[model samples]
Target: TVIKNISISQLNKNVWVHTELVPSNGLVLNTSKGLVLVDSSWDDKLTKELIEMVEKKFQKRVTDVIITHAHADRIGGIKTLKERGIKAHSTALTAELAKKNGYEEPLGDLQTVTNLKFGNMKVETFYPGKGHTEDNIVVWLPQYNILVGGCLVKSTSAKDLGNVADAYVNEWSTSIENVLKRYRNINAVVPGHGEVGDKGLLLHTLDLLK
Candidate 1:
């Protein structure tokens, strides 16, 4: 069975939550037009249940899926969304990695198709820099004071920055700074894994990099 939780706040009117065995969580935001999913869970079971929960709670269909990064725990159930005709979106590097890893055979350009008109919300993809991954991008909800920090945000116990196998240690700190600069009003950050954090987490993450 799928295990998940839901939380709603003024930060985003349509935010929904789903958790994984690794303690990572996914979010769905019901926008003015269609729904936007932050990430898919680890398996079809969870993905299906996530869809069901969204449908029952919000009574809307998820029209788009946003993969935080190329991690299996984050994009494992992408096929489930594809089967329902929902388009998948990610950074070019992430899409390339997904294709290279055989996660999606015959992959092509990272496509994003919008069903409705976006007003003042700039919902475009952003490659903040190579911190967690070269293709990692953050979804900045400027109006809500929220930032979806993919794998860049780590646990409170993380004494160090993070596993740098696929990261740019020198640039990671700058990337976080860039994010802060862009969204100075940001108050809460929903990380790729672990619970959500506040501006302090952002400061601590930057300090660790120094």
Candidate 2:
């Protein structure tokens, strides 16, 4: 439940979510090969703790990482991942933006959509147009009917789109609609922040966009 300064909760059999200083959430996947992490924490210390927690609890090393965007909270642990020789995955634009911002690069570069199979798990990364950021992405685990909407999808409690500095307000609603069209049976929705919910979270986000 508690990992150092952060707290982790098991969303399902293979999925776990953690939060630290910010309300933002990070995920850990117990994969066939090892562990697949989704976003690191805010800084090196938090990231280190996250890795340690996953390794200790899951009894597997982190083999790969998927960052949803280029935000500091999302890509902050890239340097640590590189040091451990773990491959980090992200959209090409995310990698470029991270580099431009003086951060370590993600090894796996994707375009609009990329399908990745690890053991029996099918991971699909979709760039459903820009919302939270130009490179924001959502990860779909079709097997579990789960959608990790990163920062692109706001939490159910989110009254308004929190940070618009990097967001495309005009296109945010359309982007969310595209996500809905792509995955119709999403049973679980994990936003970048706040508590997890079902498809209602997606609808709530769309409402916030309008």
Best by TM-score: 2
Candidate 2 global CA lDDT score = 0.86
> How does each model score on TM-score?
0.82, 0.95
Best model per lDDT: 2
* Candidate 2 Cα deviation (angstroms), residue 177: 0.7
For each candidate in the order shown, give its overall lDDT on alpha carbons.
0.67, 0.86
Query: What is the total number of backbone clashes in candidate 2?
Result: 0
For model 2, which pairs clash?
A: none
TM-score of 1: 0.82
Stretches > 4 Å off in candidate 2 = 1-5
lDDT for each residue of candidate 1 in 1-210, tens digit (9 for 90 to 100): 222343322344555555666566666677766677777777778777777777776776877777868866666777787788877777667777877776862122343321222333445445667787766777766556767777777656567766678888888888888877777776777777677777667787877778
lDDT of 2 by residue, 113-145 (tens): 899987677899999998889889999998899
Global lDDT of model 1: 0.67
